[PDB]
Design a binder for these strands. Structure first.
Ligand SMILES: Nc1ncnc2c1ncn2[C@@H]1O[C@H](CSCC[C@H](N)C(=O)O)[C@@H](O)[C@H]1O
Ligand SMILES: Nc1ncnc2c1ncn2[C@@H]1O[C@H](CSCC[C@H](N)C(=O)O)[C@@H](O)[C@H]1O
Lengths: 178, 285, 285, 194
DNA sequence: CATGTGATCTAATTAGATCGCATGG
DNA sequence: CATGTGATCTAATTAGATCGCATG
C-alpha cells in the first residue's frame, strides 16, 4: 500500500528510456563518470533504493578496461548503502553483456559475493546479472553453458535488450506502479 | 580502569613479515598475526624468523568475508600490493586495473570487510603502502578507493638509501616529522662489513634488479675493498633496509633471491616510525 | 711462577681461519696470526670475521726461510694441505707427489724452517691434518716426512656429521679420549632451523660436492619441511661443522661456494679438543 | 763456512750417496782408498732418522736424479723430496765445526715446475754444466763454494730444452760432468791414489 | 658392503648490459 | 632531467646426476 516512488542511481548507462517504459526533478540520478565522484557526492544526491550499473556492449566508445566498470560500481555501491537503522529496502544491479572474461568474472563474483545468473535470447545476444533481488536468483531461468555463451560471444565479435527490461520489472512490487 | 589488549593483525602481501618484526621491536604484544602471501621464499623467512607465530592463509583472493568474520576481529590491517604493474620503472606496466596491479583492489575489499560497523568505536588502524613513481591516474584511483590522500615518506631521512614511498592509512601522526634515532644508520659506510669503504653517503633506490645497486646512469660501483670496486653484499642491503643482519639468510637463497625479497620490502625504520604510536593503544611487554 | 705470553701462529692453507676462530674461543691471546691462503673467498671470510687481525702472505710457495726468520719466531704451526689429489673419492687423483698433493711438502718445508734449533727448549707446537681416505703409500710418506704417526679423530663423537680425519703433531694429549661437551650438537635435529625435521641422527661426510649432503647410495634427502624433502641449508651445515651461524654469509657467496669453504674446513669441536691444552702454555683471558 | 784446513789435518771424507753409487768417481779422484767410508742407500722410502745417524756421521750427502731413461718407477720430484728429507737427517749438530757439503744433480729430468721446487727447497738456483767435445748437460745444487764462484760456459734453458729433446730421443749418467764438481773438495779432505 | 676435504658432464642460473619514459621535482 | 618495489636477452658461470675403486 504505502509504497513511495523508486529512487535509482544508474552508472555508466542511462536506463531512463526503459525506466519509464517500465513506468516508475528526476528520481534517477546519472553520473557523468565516477572517477572523481566521492562519498559526499553520492550522499548529497539523496538516499537511493536501487543502484544500477552495467558494462557497455561489445563495441567502441569504451576507453576503460572491462574490470574498471566493476570496481567503480562496487565502490559507489558502498557509498549508497544506508545505515543499519534505515528500514527502507535496498537493491543493486550489475549486469554484463559478455565482455568480461573468465579472470574478470571471478573478480565479479568475489567482490559482489554471489555468482551471476545468465540471460539468453535466440530467435540475439546474452547477458549475466549479479543482484540481491530474490526474483532473479530465486526465480528459475533457462540454464545456458558458459561455453555456449562463449561461442555466442565469438559469434557476436564476428558479427560487428528486452531482458534488461525483463530484469528491472520485478521490482515494481516494492515501489509505485505506473 | 580498563587494561589494553594485545593487537590482532591482518597482514596482506606480507612479504618477509616486516610488520610483525617492527611490532615485536616496539614491544607490542601480538595475539594473532594472519598473513596473506604466495611466495614460498617469503613464507619460509617469516616462518623461520618468527617461530611459526604467523598464520599463513594463502592467496589474498582466497580470503572471503566469511573468513574475516571467523578469524577476526582485527585491530590492524596492513599491506602493500605488488607494484611491478604500477611503477614507471617498468615500460611494460599493465596498470592498476590489470596484471598484478588489480591486486590493490583486494586490499580495498578485505579492508572494507574488516572495518568495524558504524556505531562500533573500537580502535581500528590500517596502513597501505606503494611506490611514489606510479602514474598520475593510478595514484588518483587508489586514493579514491581508500578515500584518503597518502603521505610521502622517504627512507633517506632515517636510513642510507633513497626510497620515496606513499602511505595511505589512519595511524596516529602519519604526518609528524621523522626523527633519526641513534639506532638508525644514516650513511652507507655504517652498513658495510669490515674492510670495505663506501663511495656514497646515500645509495639510490634498491629494486629487485642488480642495476639498482650500481649508482648513477654510469653504473658506478658503491664500494671499495682493498682498492677493488664492488657492489653491496646481502648483509649490507639488510642493514641498509634496517633488517637484522642475516635476516634473509634462509633456504639456500642466492644473493639475487635475497635481493628479490629485500627490494620489494618496506624500510624497517620507516614502519617503526609509523607503528610507534600504536604502543599507546595496545598491550606491551 | 712465570707469566706466559700471547701465542704466535703460522697457519698454512688457512681456509676460513678456523684456527684463529678456536684460539679466540679458548681465550688464548694471539699476538700474531700469519696465514698463507690463495682463495679470495677464503681470504674475505677471514678478513671480515676477524677484523683484519690475520696477516695474509699469499701463496705458501712464496714463503722463504728468510720470511720465517723475520716474521717469527712462531709457537704454533698449523695447516692441512689440499686433499683433492690425495682422497680416494677422486678417481683422477694425482697423488702425493703431483697436482695439489705435493703442496704437503711445503708444509714440511716451512715446519722445518720454523722449528727451534736443537738446544732451544722453548714451547713449540705443530698440527697437520688430512683425510683418512688416502692411499696407503701416501699416508706412509706423510708420516715419514713428519717423523710421526697420526691420530685418528672422527668428528662424529662431537658433532652431527661423520668426518674421519688424520692428525699429525706434537700437541699435548692428542690421543686422549674425546668428550662431548655441552656446547656440541651431536644430532642433526639440533642443527636445523625452526620448522624442519631431521631424517638422520648423523649425516655422512660433507665434501665440497652436493651429492655428499644427500645420504647414502640412494641419495636420501636429510630433512623434512612441510612434509617435503629438502637438503641442508648453509646455516645448518655451519652448525654441523661447529661454526657460528652465518659465519660464511659474506661476499654474496652462493650456497655452493659456501659449501666449498665448509667442505674443505675443519670440524670446530675437533680442533677445540686439540687446541685445549695450549691454554696452559700461553697467556689467556 | 768457506775456510780450508792444512793438509796434515784432513780426514778421509765420509759420504752418503742416494739413488746412485758414486764410489767409482770418488776413488778415481782419491777420496777413498781401495780397502774394504761411503754409504749408498738402497731404497730411502723406509729410512728413518736413527738409520742415517747409526750409519755414522757424514761430511757429504750426494743425490742425483736417474738419467734420461725408463728407470723412473718414481716421479722425478720424488728423488728431490727424498734427498731433502735425508739431507736434514744427516746435517751435524749446530755445535760441530767440521766442513759439511751436500750436492744434488739433475740430468735434465726435471721440467720447469719441478725445477722451481728444487731451487725453493734448497734455497739456491742450479748451475748448468755444458759438455762440449754439445752432448750433455747437468744442473747442480750445492753449498760447494767453488761451484758457485767458478763459472763454466753459460747456456740458456732453451738450449738445454733442445738437448733434453735429443736426450729423450736417443734413450747411464755423464760422470765427466759429475767428476769436476768433486774437484774443489780435495782441498778439504784427505787425498789418496794408486 | 659401504664409503668419500672430487670431477665430468648436462641443463640450469646469473651476470650484466640494455631498454624504458612519465613524472615530480 | 635524473630517476625508478622491472623485464628482456645471452654469453660466460654455476647447479646437480652420475661416475669412480682403494681402502679400511
Ligand atoms: N595473489 C597474491 N596473494 C597474496 N600475496 C601476493 C599475491 N601475489 C603477490 N603477493 C605478494 O605480495 C607481496 C608484495 S611486496 C610487499 C612485501 C612486504 N611489504 C614486506 O615488507 O616484505 C610479494 O611478497 C608477493 O609475493
Ligand atoms: N698454493 C697455495 N698456497 C696457500 N694456500 C693454498 C694454496 N693452494 C691451495 N691453498 C688452500 O689450502 C686450503 C686447504 S683446505 C684447508 C682449510 C682449513 N683447514 C679450514 O679450516 O678452513 C684451501 O683453502 C686452499 O685454498
Amino acid at each position: 500500500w504505502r509504497r513511495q516512488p523508486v529512487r535509482v542511481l544508474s552508472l555508466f548507462e542511462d536506463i531512463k528510456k526503459e525506466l519509464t517504459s517500465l513506468g516508475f526533478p528526476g528520481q534517477l540520478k546519472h553520473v557523468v563518470d565516477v572517477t572523481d565522484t566521492v562519498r559526499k557526492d553520492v550522499e548529497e544526491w539523496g538516499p537511493f533504493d536501487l543502484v544500477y550499473g552495467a558494462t557497455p556492449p561489445l563495441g567502441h566508445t569504451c576507453d576503460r578496461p572491462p574490470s574498471w566498470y566493476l570496481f567503480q560500481f562496487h565502490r559507489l555501491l558502498q557509498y549508497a548503502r544506508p545505515k543499519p537503522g534505515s528500514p527502507r529496502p535496498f537493491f543493486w544491479m550489475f549486469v554484463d553483456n559478455l565482455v568480461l572474461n573468465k579472470e574478470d568474472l571471478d573478480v565479479a563474483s568475489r567482490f559482489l559475493e554471489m555468482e551471476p545468473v545468465t540471460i539468453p535470447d535466440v530467435h540475439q545476444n546474452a547477458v549475466r546479472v549479479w543482484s540481491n533481488i530474490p526474483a532473479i536468483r530465486s526465480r528459475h531461468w533457462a540454464l545456458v553453458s558458459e561455453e555456449e555463451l562463449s561461442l555466442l560471444a565469438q559469434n557476436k565479435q564476428s558479427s560487428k535488450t528486452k531482458l534488461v527490461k525483463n530484469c528491472f520489472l520485478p521490482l515494481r512490487e516494492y515501489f509505485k506502479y505506473f | 580502569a580498563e587494561k589494553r589488549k594485545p593487537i590482532r593483525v591482518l597482514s596482506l602481501f606480507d612479504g618477509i613479515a616486516t610488520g610483525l618484526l617492527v611490532l615485536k621491536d616496539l614491544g607490542i604484544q601480538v595475539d594473532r598475526y594472519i598473513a596473506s602471501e604466495v611466495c614460498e621464499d617469503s613464507i619460509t623467512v617469516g616462518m623461520v624468523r618468527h617461530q611459526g607465530k604467523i598464520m599463513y592463509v594463502g592467496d589474498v583472493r582466497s580470503v572471503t568475508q566469511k573468513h574475516i568474520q571467523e578469524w577476526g576481529p582485527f585491530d590492524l590491517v596492513i599491506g602493500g600490493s605488488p607494484c611491478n604493474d604500477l611503477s614507471i620503472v617498468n615500460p611494460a606496466r599493465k596498470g592498476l586495473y590489470e596484471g598484478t596491479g588489480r591486486l590493490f583492489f583486494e586490499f580495498y575489499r578485505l579492508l572494507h570487510d574488516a572495518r568495524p560497523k558504524e556505531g562500533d568505536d573500537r580502535p581500528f588502524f590500517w596502513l597501505f603502502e606503494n611506490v611514489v613513481a606510479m602514474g598520475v591516474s593510478d595514484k588518483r584511483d587508489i586514493s579514491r578507493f581508500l578515500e584518503s590522500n597518502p603521505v610521502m615518506i622517504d627512507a633517506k631521512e632515517v636510513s642510507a638509501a633513497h626510497r620515496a614511498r606513499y602511505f595511505w592509512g589512519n595511524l596516529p601522526g602519519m604526518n609528524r616529522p621523522l626523527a633519526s634515532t641513534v639506532n638508525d644508520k644514516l650513511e652507507l659506510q655504517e652498513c658495510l662489513e669490515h674492510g670495505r669503504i663506501a663511495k656514497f653517503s646515500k645509495v639510490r633506490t634498491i629494486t629487485t634488479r642488480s642495476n639498482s645497486i650500481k649508482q648513477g646512469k654510469d653504473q658506478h660501483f658503491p664500494v671499495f675493498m682493498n682498492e677493488k670496486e664492488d657492489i653491496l653484499w646481502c648483509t649490507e642491503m639488510e642493514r641498509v633496509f634496517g633488517f637484522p643482519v642475516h635476516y634473509t639468510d634462509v633456504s639456500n637463497m642466492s644473493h639475487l633471491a635475497r635481493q628479490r625479497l629485500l627490494g620489494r620490502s618496506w624500510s624497517v625504520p620507516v614502519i617503526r616510525h609509523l607503528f610507534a604510536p600504536l604502543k599507546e593503544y595496545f598491550a606491551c611487554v
